[PDB]
């Protein structure tokens, strides 16, 4: 069972695999139901939108932090700054997250601003009865898109102090690479009687 | 779990539908296809929006 100049393969089919084969034959089916569900809900939910107001948030890890993507909810801080309490903010269709923390003031302002805008651009019907029919915007997401912030300008002057960048990296890499040892030569030379 | 549906490159799908549209002029083509269009004015046959 080995011949020719073929690539070595790894087709894992030695369990009773024909026993667990899902064919999404219901791909069209679900889409429709999925769609119907949204429509039933959209109606049931009176004039509210189908979603909640999510916050801006910088993405995790070395790879995606360049981007900014919708988060879960607004942090007790942001909510507070934007002039309301969570208990309420939860009834006004704002998502709140007790877990998330503020450490970056650029994002915190962003989010607070986001809340401000949302607040002004909604209208909250009174508890009474009247229900002054006012037409539903379905999305909150569409309405208040999240965008990537502007990090610089298009053109600008070239300032070259002359220090290679490359070399700064090599040096920087280096400094960390020996950071320990030199603290031992600082401990060992400190014990110079 | 046999293959039922086929994937065509979206672009080529359009090359085809485009091609298809273009032949609906070309009266001999139309003619050839069944379709009794001898005794019609011109092709493409265009008709009032009131339709």
């Amino acid at each position: 069972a080995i011949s020719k100049n073929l690539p070595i393969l790894k087709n894992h089919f030695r369990k009773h695999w024909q026993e667990r084969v899902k064919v999404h034959f219901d791909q069209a089916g679900k889409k429709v139901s999925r769609r119907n569900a949204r429509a039933t809900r959209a109606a049931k939910i009176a004039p509210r939108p189908l979603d909640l107001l999510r916050p801006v948030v910088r993405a995790p890890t070395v790879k995606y932090n360049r981007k900014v993507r919708a988060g879960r909810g607004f942090t007790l801080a942001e909510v507070k700054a934007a002039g309301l309490t969570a208990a309420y903010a939860r009834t006004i269709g704002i998502a709140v997250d007790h877990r998330r923390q503020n450490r970056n003031q650029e994002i915190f302002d962003a989010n607070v601003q986001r809340l401000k805008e949302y607040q002004s651009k909604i209208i909250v019907f009174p508890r009474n009865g009247k229900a002054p029919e006012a037409e539903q915007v379905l999305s909150a997401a569409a309405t208040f898109p999240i965008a990537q912030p502007a990090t610089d300008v298009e053109a600008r002057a070239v300032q070259d102090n002359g220090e290679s960048a490359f070399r700064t990296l090599r040096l920087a890499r280096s400094e960390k690479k020996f950071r320990g040892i030199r603290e031992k030569r600082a401990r060992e030379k400190a014990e110079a009687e | 779990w046999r293959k039922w549906n086929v994937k065509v490159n979206h672009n080529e799908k359009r090359y085809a539908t485009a091609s298809a549209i273009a032949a609906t002029a070309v009266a001999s083509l139309v003619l050839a296809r069944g379709h009794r269009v001898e005794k019609i004015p011109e092709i493409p046959l265009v008709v009032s929006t009131d339709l």
């Binding site: 069972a1 080995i2 011949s3 020719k4 100049n5 073929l6 070595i8 890890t61 070395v62 790879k63 360049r66 990090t151 610089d152 300008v153 298009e154 053109a155 600008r156 002057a157 070239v158 300032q159 070259d160 290679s164 960048a165 490359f166 700064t168 990296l169 | -």
Partner: protein
């Protein structure tokens, strides 16, 4: 489709094109990669030298991402400027106003130096640079600005 296949053509021939002597039996060589060090060693060395045994060190829980770092060569570079904007900057090669290219924003990690950009000044923002790429960049009056 069945109709184009060579079994349709074998109907009426005794052995389906599998020989009268050597037959078509279940698994003559063994199954799968059986015997790779024995009766299938000749095919394994040649075609697949290097297969058996170990080299290098194990890395438990290696998460790629940690190592994310796409490269862009100077080679292209200028491609990261939209064409309309591009020609505008080529002509009027200058300090005072020179284009800023966030190569991190283009989703690159490091700039390498494949070959010749014009003599236009560029401000190049990147996480990493090959010694040469940066050299060549300065040689047109650009600088590299180190970001994250």
């Amino acid at each position: 489709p069945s109709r184009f296949t060579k079994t349709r053509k074998h109907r009426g021939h005794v052995s389906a094109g599998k020989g009268r002597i050597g037959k078509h039996r279940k698994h003559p060589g063994g199954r799968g990669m059986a015997g790779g060090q024995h009766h299938h060693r000749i095919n394994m060395d040649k075609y697949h030298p290097g297969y058996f045994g170990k080299v290098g060190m194990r890395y438990f829980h290696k998460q790629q991402a940690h190592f994310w770092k796409p490269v862009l060569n100077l080679d292209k570079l200028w491609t990261l400027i939209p064409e309309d904007k591009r020609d505008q900057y080529l002509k009027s090669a200058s300090k005072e106003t020179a284009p800023v290219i966030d190569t991190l924003a283009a989703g690159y990690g490091k700039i390498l130096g494949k070959g010749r950009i014009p003599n236009v000044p560029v401000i190049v923002k990147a996480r990493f640079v090959s010694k040469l790429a940066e050299e060549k960049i300065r040689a047109a009056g650009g600088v590299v600005e180190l970001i994250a």
